[PDB]
Amino acid sequence: PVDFTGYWKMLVNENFEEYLRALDVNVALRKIANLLKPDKEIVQDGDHMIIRTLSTFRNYIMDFQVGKEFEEDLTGIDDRKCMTTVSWDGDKLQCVQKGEKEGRGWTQWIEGDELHLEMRVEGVVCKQVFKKVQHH
Numbered sequence: 770p771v772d773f774t775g776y777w778k779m780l781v782n783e784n785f786e787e788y789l790r791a792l793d794v795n796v797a798l799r800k801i802a803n804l805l806k807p808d809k810e811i812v813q814d815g816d817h818m819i820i821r822t823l824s825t826f827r828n829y830i831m832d833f834q835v836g837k838e839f840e841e842d843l844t845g846i847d848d849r850k851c852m853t854t855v856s857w858d859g860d861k862l863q864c865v866q867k868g869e870k871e872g873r874g875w876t877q878w879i880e881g882d883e884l885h886l887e888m889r890v891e892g893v894v895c896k897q898v899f900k901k902v903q904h905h
């Protein structure tokens with residue numbers, strides 16, 4: 770039974786700048802964004818998932834139903850809109866973000882006390898790992 774509910778602190782963030790470059794984010798924001806170490810606050814409530822990615826000056830909030838396509842507004846990332854579906858694949862969450870870019874999506878799973886998140890677009894891959902924490 771995978772349950773992503775919890776508060777999660779960033780441990781590593783690998784190859785994020787190239788991932789953002791593939792989304793056409795210009796170099797100034799790539800460098801700013803890659804220095805950020807946001808937390809994630811997740812509530813999994815049945816198949817209703819809220820994923821809050823939180824940092825001092827910039828946040829990005831996802832709020833969706835697993836299995837149901839929705840219009841994802843990536844405002845503050847690359848400012849595109851996608852038709853996104855997040856689905857269960859065993860104990861992994863598989864996200865496909867349909868839109869102008871090919872092969873855009875991500876995969877999320879848990880190993881022990883680690884939240885693993887691999888994001889992809891146009892064959893470019895970024896890997897993030899977060900640790901479960903208790904100070905809120």
Ligand SMILES: C=C(C)[C@@H]1CCC(C)=C[C@H]1c1c(O)cc(C)cc1O
Pocket residue numbers: 779782789798801802803805806807822823824827828829845846847897
């Ligand atoms: C803080 C947020 C929401 C920023 C917002 C700006 C950009 C382009 C990316 C986000 C980001 C992450 O989702 C995840 C990580 C690790 C860094 C990071 O910088």
